Structure 1
Amino acid sequence: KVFGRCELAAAMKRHGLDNYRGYSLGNWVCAAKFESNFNTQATNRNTDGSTDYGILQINSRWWCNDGRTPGSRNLCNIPCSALLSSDITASVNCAKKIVSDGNGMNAWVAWRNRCKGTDVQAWIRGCRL
């Protein structure tokens, strides 16, 4: 599923992402845009052999199991395919664990290089939340 900006804002808010660990909703919407273009089915293979999955591009090396990543820790205890669903519950629940880790949202390269230090509030402007 390809989410609309406000549509995704509302689903993330409903799932408790607004201000989760101090990160306003705009941060999450901004990260999803630049990580997957709001597409739940997005996949990207990395040079280390791992693959990123879903709306928030969760990595198969540490967070999910895709059956082809050697030394996968599967910290979210879910098959990576579960992260490609039109229902963002699995991705949001795994994202909460990642963000609670240690480096916060810096774990998402797109957030660090394109959202961090910007007016992320603009990502939810006009949305009925």
Structure 2
Amino acid sequence: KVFGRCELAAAMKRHGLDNYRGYSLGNWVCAAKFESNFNTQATNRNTDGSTDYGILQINSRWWCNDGRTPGSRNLCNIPCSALLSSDITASVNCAKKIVSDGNGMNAWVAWRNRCKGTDVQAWIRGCRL
């Protein structure tokens, strides 16, 4: 599924991301825009052989099991394919664990380079919510 901007903002709010660990909703919508273009089916392979999955491009070296990242962890206790569902519950729950692990949203390279320090509430302006 490819979300609309305000549709995704509403879904993220319902699942408890607005102000989660101090990050306002616009940060999460900005991160999803540049990580995946709002597409739950996005995948990208990394040079170390791990793959990033889903609307927040969660990585198989630490967070999910894809059966082909030897010597990796599965800290969200999920198959990576669950991160590609049209239902974003699994991605949101795993993202809450990532952002809690000490490094905040700096775990998402696109957030650090394209969202951090910008007017992120622009991403939810005009939305009913």
Q: Name the TM-score class by shorter chain.
A: over 0.9
Q: Secondary structure at the match of 2:44?
A: strand
2:104 and 2:128 map into 1 onto residues whose CA distance is 27
How far residue 34 of structure 1 moved from its aligned partner, in angstroms, is: 0.1
2:78 and 2:60 map into 1 onto residues whose CA distance is 10
How far residue 71 of structure 1 moved from its aligned partner, in angstroms, is: 1.2
1:95 and 1:70 map into 2 onto residues whose CA distance is 22
Q: Secondary structure at the match of 1:33?
A: helix
Deviations 1:44-91 (A, max 9, x none): 000000000000000000000000001111000000000000000000
Identity of aligned residues (%): 100
Deviations 1:80-121 (A, max 9, x none): 000000000000000000000010000000000000000000
Deviations 1:1-35 (A, max 9, x none): 00000000000000000000000000000000000
Unaligned 5+ segments in structure 1 are: none
Q: What is the match of residue 29 of structure 2?
A: 29
CA RMSD of superposed structures (Å)? 0.3
Unaligned 5+ segments in structure 2 are: none
Compute the TM-score of the two structures, normalised by the length of structure 2. 1.00
2:104 and 2:66 map into 1 onto residues whose CA distance is 24
Compute the TM-score of the two structures, normalised by the length of structure 1. 1.00
Alignment size in residue pairs: 129
Q: Secondary structure at the match of 1:44?
A: strand
2:81 and 2:75 map into 1 onto residues whose CA distance is 15
1:85 and 1:72 map into 2 onto residues whose CA distance is 22
Runs of 4+ in 1 over 6 A off after TM superposition: none
